[PDB]
TrEMBL record, chain D:
One of its GO terms (biological process) is translation. Belongs to the eukaryotic ribosomal protein eS8 family. Keywords: Ribonucleoprotein, Ribosomal protein. Residues 1-42 are annotated as: Disordered. Residues 6-26 have a biased composition (Basic residues). InterPro entries: Ribosomal_eS8 (IPR001047), Ribosomal_Se8/biogenesis_NSA2 (IPR022309). One of its GO terms (cellular component) is ribosome. This is 40S ribosomal protein S8. One of its GO terms (molecular function) is structural constituent of ribosome. Residues 27-36 have a biased composition (Polar residues).
Length: 171, 68, 259, 164
RNA sequence: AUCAGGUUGAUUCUGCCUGACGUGGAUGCUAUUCUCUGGGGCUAAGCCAUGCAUGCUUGUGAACUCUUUGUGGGGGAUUAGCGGACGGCUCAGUGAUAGCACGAUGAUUUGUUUGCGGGAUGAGCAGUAGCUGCGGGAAACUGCAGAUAGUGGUCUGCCCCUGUGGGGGUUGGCAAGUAAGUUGUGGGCCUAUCAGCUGGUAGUUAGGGUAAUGGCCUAACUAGGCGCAGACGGGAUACGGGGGAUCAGGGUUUGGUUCCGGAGAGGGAGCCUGAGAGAUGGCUACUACGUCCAAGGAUGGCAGCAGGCGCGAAACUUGCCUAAUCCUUUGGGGAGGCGGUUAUGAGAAGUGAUGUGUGUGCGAGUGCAAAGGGGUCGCAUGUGAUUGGAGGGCAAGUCGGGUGCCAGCAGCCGCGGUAAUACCUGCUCCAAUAGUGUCUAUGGUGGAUGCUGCAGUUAAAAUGUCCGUAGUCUGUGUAUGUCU
RNA sequence: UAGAGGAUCGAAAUCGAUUAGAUACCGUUUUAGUUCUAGCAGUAAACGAUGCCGACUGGACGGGACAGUGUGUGUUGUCCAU
């Protein structure tokens, strides 16, 4: 009647490895994540793109970089991960397909709503932003967004505000 | 074995737990987990008591349930 | 399993009908009659999904039992009646006429036309036989016409009156004509013949779109609709059947990529 | 009953049969009808599609054709003298297709007098005993009638060596 | 595209055993919310109490009835017609006679649908349903008399094959579309402690039967047909595909289960009606188990939806529906829809916070066939963590107290004999977290089955020696454009 | 298994020693067998514990056969590198 579903996360190949357990305890500390499932969700998201860029460079089919090259560069720019590239020069693009491979897992954890109610100063810390996103006190220009994992867009970032009908509002 | 009428021996795991069972009791047994060989220093036994009259044997030992 | 089936599950309905995957388990089963089964749509979907007149089925059966519809100038009251390619649908109140076509995405399409264009039909000649002392020819929508010219053969396009059902004039296929592809890989594309060659009992038409693209297709998936590039016998849809490729669709949205 | 499927035969290599189905009315057959001579009796049977066959159980009065003149006459059937497959069908007077019968000679009295007693003298000798020979080319169990032609010359000599 | 622990006083190897990661079934403890998706297949294709799952349409108008009354009306029984061959359930049989792919039907039939064609208002006799009466029987079921539409014979005419004779038939058609039947070649379940197999068996000629080709069947005659490129046999939990799992590449494993194809309705057989059935919510017989009786008879078929018993480690409601989707579109519909029940899987939020409760409850409106829920508003209000571990492999204590090779632990290596980092009990800490452990099957792990890509002097393994047929190799089956 | 033959040695049997005891090692008496002809059988640490065929690759001291004349071809033993 639809689909069974699918899995968003994965699991580490070896459970108890200290060089991997030390840097994961930081990310759930500096960004206030809720458990390890949220972090392996975002790793798979960020790893799909790299595997997509390498195939676009070793491609003998001459009509690939035009269509699918720039397609994947528009999609990143829309979210605030890459800068601004002139999508008309064959060399200014293939250098943009070389900066996709040199990325962090911080360029993705920072386009997320729990961290955007912090940079644009509205909350004390990332343990308060989660407490008043769920309380229905943030509104992206018309919408009362309520889930602290909404991945904001570039051309919609500055429009954040309080909820003009909430207790933190004027009415 | 109620299903096939074969005779078997099984091992009763925990401390002081052989004394909840009586004779003419019913019991659920399962494997050991090593492909049909014996494990440790227990010779000849390939099975393991699990329940005693529909109550978990591991829960009676930890105090979560009451004896039958 | 030796007796005929009377139901359609919705997963198996043709893609041209544009039916939603959910929305029930069944779909309307079409009746026998004029066109083939893989080349028709039931009448009841055309009045409630492509015109959005009736919002229901209690209402759709008030529009058909009050005798307000005419397929090819002939009243129809059955919602399972099948409608095919190049057919005229008329509606008296709120006087209108439509012709049944395809997209370039190969879906169905209703194209509004005028009143002196709603007296036409184009079909191919497929069979030819003699019975009882009369010569006949068989259309591709299935009719027989008696007492036509003695010089009409298999393949030619004929123009049917649609208000007396009699031939008017025809087209013989040759270079510098126009074509509509009614099925296959290239369904819904209009071209202009360049070469006609043969193979192991086949004829293949090299074609050329109205934008320069090239083309090729057998003679069983094509109907002639014109004498030359400015003498077409029907009105084409908004886009004329171009099918721009996917290189040429991002440049529209993104510009070119020069070195 | 009779059934014309081949699901029960040995295979091309000699292997025994394996059946995984009951019989179907699709392939049902009949017992042989055995058309004898005397006192016409034909029966209509209902076949697939609602259609109709005619099954002759007894027949008189064939419908034969004299070939040299091209005229049909209706003669009377006297007895059977040869069948190419089974001669136990001659002792019973059963009328299948391509059986040779002895026919009554009066109705052809005008026709036979355009041939001399020259190269066909064996056709004129049996005419004076009162009979001619014919052959049946219809299927009496499928259409309900006998219909053939008279033997002359090459044919009449080829078959005459068979039934003596 | 990854490895670790274990044979020695120490060393390098060979070799398997165990850990570390997924997935399907069963099971222990523990649980706040919503959204999508699943649930008596494995054992017994075992046996079934009760309710429902199939009925409609008239150019047909009986009893009865009305009117101040007549080629008048109401009324609705029965005739006639259409449907019940689909839909739904299940996986016993079947290893290719089924299924998938590409072909032949010039060897065939097809109600309803579409467009053309076609049609006895003549004589003369028989005679029926409902209806009006007399009745039989425990029942289930049934008879006789009376009187009437449709109707059934026979003549007459019409049509067909013939004709210098005659003999048949009773109005049945053409072309598309839809459906169905028949048929050719090709494909890795395991097995040689299965090597020779076959009598309608291989062919010819004639006929019968069929909607139709054909040993499909019969009469006569010829002696053929298959096989190490595996015939003919035997075994295991064998319904075939579309599909699923695992994951560098190459591969290995699985599919009772939504969609399409097949087969079956306790077991076997045989048939009627019909355009279509070898039909089982049709009939007839034998056979397994039965049920009701006044004893003489009469009867049954849940592998349809709920439900019960049995079996087992193993699986939900005897609920609501004249609404959506369709079939037969205000008739019928357990098809299908709507909730309820359950740690089936997958996704998303919580268990608090200092400036100003992510919960629970109630009230409006919305929503529906009627209701749950949900989301848009307000009112009070304040609750909500476990499971497995701490000697090494493998993240985390030589911490307190008990026991003394005992009781117990431990996949593997190993621990315990009064000096326990390993057992029992209390604290403290570790991993994942509405979850987390155990038993069983299976992919990877495994270059530990090796096409890519192993080994064979001594670790397991080159045969006591030559000759030699089939096969492989050598000597003299390809790539690619266009269309389908 | 059949015929022929019979010097030497010798399982089995037997005594004498040795020994705690030796049905053994050592010895005495004495056989089948050990040989030949005709056959059956089909095994070995039947071993270099080392399939068969084809292409290519450094030195030193030798042997055996043939042919040449200062060397060649087929085989083969020992010793040093890569």
């Amino acid at each position: 009647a639809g689909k069974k579903g699918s899995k968003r996360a994965s699991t580490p190949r070896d459970p108890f490895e200290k060089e991997r357990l030390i840097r994961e305890a930081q990310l759930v500390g500096v960004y206030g994540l809720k458990n390890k499932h949220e972090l392996w969700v975002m790793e798979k998201i960020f790893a799909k793109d790299k595997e997509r860029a390498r195939i676009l460079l070793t491609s003998t089919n001459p009509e690939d970089i035009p269509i699918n090259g720039r397609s994947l560069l528009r999609r990143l720019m829309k979210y605030g991960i890459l800068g601004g590239i002139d999508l008309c020069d064959k060399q200014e693009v293939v250098n943009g397909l070389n900066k996709v491979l040199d990325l962090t897992i911080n360029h993705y954890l920072e386009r997320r709503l729990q961290f955007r109610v912090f940079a644009a100063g509205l909350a004390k810390s990332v343990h308060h932003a989660r407490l008043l996103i769920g309380g229905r006190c943030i509104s992206i220009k018309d919408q009362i967004v309520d889930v602290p994992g909404f991945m904001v867009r570039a051309d919609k970032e500055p429009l954040i505000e309080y909820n003009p009908y909430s207790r933190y509002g004027d009415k | 074995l109620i299903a096939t009428g074969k005779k078997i021996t099984a091992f009763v795991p925990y401390d002081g737990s052989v004394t909840y069972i009586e004779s003419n009791d019913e019991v659920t047994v399962e494997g050991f987990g090593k492909k049909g060989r014996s494990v440790g220093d227990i010779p000849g036994i390939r099975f393991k008591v699990c329940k005693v009259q529909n109550v978990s044997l591991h829960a009676i030992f930890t105090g979560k349930k009451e004896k039958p | 399993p030796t007796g005929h089936r009377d139901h359609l599950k919705r997963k198996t309905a043709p893609k041209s009908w544009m039916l939603d995957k959910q929305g029930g388990t069944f779909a309307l089963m079409p009746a026998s009659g004029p066109h083939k089964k893989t080349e028709c749509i039931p009448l009841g979907y055309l009045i409630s999904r492509f015109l959005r007149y009736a919002s229901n089925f209690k209402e759709l059966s008030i529009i058909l039992a009050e005798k307000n519809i005419k397929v090819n100038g002939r009243v129809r009251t059955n919602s399972h009646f099948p409608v095919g390619l190049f057919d005229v649908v008329s509606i008296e109140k709120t006087g209108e006429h439509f012709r049944v076509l395809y997209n370039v995405h190969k879906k169905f399409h209703l194209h509004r036309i005028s009143s002196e264009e709603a007296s036409y039909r184009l079909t191919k000649v497929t069979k030819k036989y003699e019975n009882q002392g009369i010569p006949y020819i068989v259309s591709s929508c299935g009719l027989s016409i008696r007492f036509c010219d003695p010089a009409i053969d298999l393949g030619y396009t004929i123009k049917i009156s649609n208000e007396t059902s009699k031939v008017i004039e025809y087209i013989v296929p040759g270079p510098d004509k126009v074509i509509f592809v009614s099925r296959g890989k290239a369904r819904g594309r209009v071209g202009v013949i360049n070469t006609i060659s043969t193979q192991g009992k086949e004829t293949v038409y090299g074609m050329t779109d109205f934008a320069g693209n090239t083309f090729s297709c057998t003679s069983k998936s094509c109907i002639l609709i014109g004498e030359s590039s400015e003498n077409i016998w029907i009105t084409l849809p908004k886009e004329r059947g171009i099918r721009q490729s996917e290189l040429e669709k991002i440049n529209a949205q993104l510009g070119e990529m020069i070195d | 009953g009779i059934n014309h499927r081949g699901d029960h035969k040995r295979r091309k290599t000699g292997a025994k049969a394996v059946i995984s189905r009951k019989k179907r009315n699709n392939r049902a057959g009949s017992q042989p009808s055995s058309t004898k001579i005397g006192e016409r009796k034909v029966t209509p049977v209902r076949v697939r599609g609602g259609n109709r066959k005619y099954k002759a159980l007894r027949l008189d009065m064939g419908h034969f054709k004299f070939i040299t003149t091209g005229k049909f006459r209706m003669a009377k059937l006297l007895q059977v003298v040869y069948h190419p497959s089974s001669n136990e069908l001659v002792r019973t007077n059963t009328l299948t297709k391509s059986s040779v019968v002895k026919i009554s000679a009066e109705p052809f009295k005008n026709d036979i007098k355009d041939v001399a007693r020259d190269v066909d003298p064996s056709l004129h000798e049996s005419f004076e005993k009162g009979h001619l020979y014919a052959i049946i080319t219809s299927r009496p169990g499928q259409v309900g009638m006998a219909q053939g032609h008279v033997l002359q010359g090459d044919e009449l000599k080829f078959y005459a060596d068979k039934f003596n």
